[PDB]
Design a protein around this ligand. Structure first.
Ligand SMILES: [Cl-]
Length: 123
């Protein structure tokens, strides 16, 4: 498993069993563990290790978890950002995953937003 941490706020992405997605600094939470798996030849899915849910950025910018493997909004591209940092971009909507300082998680098309930078680390 890997962890997905917001560089700016030091919060880890978490998919809760209720399907909501938020950020936490609780390193002991089992729900911050992810598996990155291939989808076709150029994309990835980001799946919760403990709940089996996939991260989804909806067209309206909300971010939640789903187990619907047919959903077209669970596909991501990971793009290097210099240093050990990456952006996590929805292929379908062109939105970047963002963790806000209040712990909410959402999507934005603004590539200059400081809250879209992530560091991926083995657990
Ligand atoms: Cl905020």
């Amino acid at each position: 498993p890997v962890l997905l941490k917001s560089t700016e706020t030091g919060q880890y992405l978490r998919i809760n069993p209720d399907g909501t997605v938020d950020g936490t600094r609780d390193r002991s939470d089992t729900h911050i563990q992810f598996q990155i798996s291939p989808e076709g030849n150029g994309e990835v899915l980001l799946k919760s290790t403990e709940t089996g849910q996939y991260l989804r950025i909806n067209p309206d910018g909300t971010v939640d978890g789903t187990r619907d493997r047919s959903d077209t909004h669970i596909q991501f591209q990971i793009s290097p950002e210099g240093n050990g940092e990456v952006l996590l971009k929805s292929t379908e909507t062109g939105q970047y995953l963002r963790i806000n300082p209040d712990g909410t998680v959402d999507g934005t098309r603004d590539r200059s937003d400081t809250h879209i930078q992530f560091q991926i680390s083995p657990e």
